[PDB]
Amino acid sequence: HAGTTYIFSKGGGQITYKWPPNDRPSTRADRLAIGFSTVQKEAVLVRVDSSSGLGDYLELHIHQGKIGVKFNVGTDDIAIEESNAIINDGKYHVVRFTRSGGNATLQVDSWPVIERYPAGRQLTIFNSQATIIIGGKEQGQPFQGQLSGLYYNGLKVLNMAAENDANIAIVGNVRLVGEV
Numbered sequence: 001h002a003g004t005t006y007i008f009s010k011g012g013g014q015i016t017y018k019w020p021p022n023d024r025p026s027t028r029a030d031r032l033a034i035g036f037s038t039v040q041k042e043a044v045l046v047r048v049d050s051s052s053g054l055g056d057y058l059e060l061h062i063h064q065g066k067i068g069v070k071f072n073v074g075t076d077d078i079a080i081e082e083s084n085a086i087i088n089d090g091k092y093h094v095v096r097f098t099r100s101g102g103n104a105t106l107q108v109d110s111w112p113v114i115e116r117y118p119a120g121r122q123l124t125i126f127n128s129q130a131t132i133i134i135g136g137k138e139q140g141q142p143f144q145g146q147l148s149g150l151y152y153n154g155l156k157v158l159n160m161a162a163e164n165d166a167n168i169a170i171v172g173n174v175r176l177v178g179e180v
Contacts, residue, residue, distance in 0.1 A: 001035055001092055004158040005148035005177040012142025013174030014135035015161050024051055024128045025153070030099040032060060032069075032152050037092045038145030041065050044136030045143050048152065051130040058126065060097065061141070062088060067108055069097045074123035080116035082108045094149075099126070132157055137172060146177070 006015065019025065036045060043062045050056035058071040065088040068081025080097075087093045087108060098105035102122025107113045132152055136143045150157045161168045162176055 001148040003149045009173045011173040012137040013172030014137045017132040032097040034150045035148040043143040044139040051128040
């Protein structure tokens with residue numbers, strides 16, 4: 001757990017980043033990386049939502065102990081997961097996700113990179129990204145454990161929450177881990 005770390009405990013918590021109203025980005029490619037440790041079978045770690053009216057979203061989650069990402073940029077819901085192993089063993093792991101149009105890439109630690117190409121052709125842009133929600137409380141599947149080194153398209157969100165950014169709001173059972 002390098003860099004800034006936060007712990008989510010009994011009851012769940014949430015760190016929310018809101019882009020200012022006239023600065024919501026639209027992207028053709030996305031980069032998401034985060035460090036975590038948990039023993040949960042089910043939970044939503046990170047979710048990026050487009051503004052109201054659009055269905056675009058991106059969600060990093062754990063289902064039956066397996067870490068995966070599901071996104072939608074206008075066409076179908078695309079899912080990619082590292083279902084080989086399990087990652088809810090209480091140990092520290094790193095997950096990297098990449099998106100190029102409707103194609104994706106996912107890699108846990110140093111295991112084999114997983115490449116997913118939807119058979120059905122898809123739209124290409126993650127339009128009007130409005131919020132980055134960390135903790136899964138709002139999605140109804142609170143994360144319990146540690147998250148650190150969150151990187152989303154150039155934004156080091158956890159550092160921003162620790163550097164007390166104006167566009168960040170922290171709520172619930174979430175604590176900033178002090179440091180060495």
